[PDB]
Amino acid sequence: EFENPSKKCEEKFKNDASKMACIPHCKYQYYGFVAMDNNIAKPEIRTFSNVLIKYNVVDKSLKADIRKIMHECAKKVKKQAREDSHWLNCRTTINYYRCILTDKRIGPQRFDRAIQEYDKTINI
Numbered sequence: 001e002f003e004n005p006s007k008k009c010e011e012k013f014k015n016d017a018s019k020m021a022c023i024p025h026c027k028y029q030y031y032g033f034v035a036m037d038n039n040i041a042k043p044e045i046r047t048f049s050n051v052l053i054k055y056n057v058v059d060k061s062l063k064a065d066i067r068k069i070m071h072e073c074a075k076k077v078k079k080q081a082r083e084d085s086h087w088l089n090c091r092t093t094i095n096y097y098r099c100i101l102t103d104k105r106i107g108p109q110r111f112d113r114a115i116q117e118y119d120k121t122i123n124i
Contacts, residue, residue: 002123005030006116018089024097025090030124031115038092040074055114058105066103073099 003011009026013019028034032047049066052058058066077095084091101108 004119005122005124006119008124021090021094025093027115027119028093028096030122031118034093034096040070040077040092040096045070045074051118052106052111052114055110055117057107057110057114062105065105069103070100 005027008030009023010019012026013022016022025034029036031051033044033051034040035044045067049063049070052066053060053063073096076099077092080095081088081091100106101111
């Protein structure tokens with residue numbers, strides 16, 4: 001029985017008081033936008049930018065710019081979380097998501113719709 005990452009992650013964290021943070025983080029890991037070890041590097045950025053372009057969140061001509069801001073955000077997210085307490089979990093995706101959406105060009109509504117549609121194509 002195969003499910004979309006959204007459903008799989010909701011089930012995993014159904015009895016977890018941290019679920020509002022860990023459900024999105026679980027999903028981004030299944031999408032390949034964040035590595036299973038919480039790192040964000042070239043492979044994850046190539047995947048995430050490819051999804052955003054395919055769903056026309058930004059024009060295809062901006063693919064180099066979006067990869068550059070994703071690399072900027074991966075660095076800033078690492079530096080933000082360095083002093084994080086041991087028990088603060090699932091923040092990588094939260095901080096990465098917020099950072100990407102500080103780019104003036106990316107509309108949060110289109111961005112969310114693209115990832116929701118991408119979610120439906122993954123059966124795991």
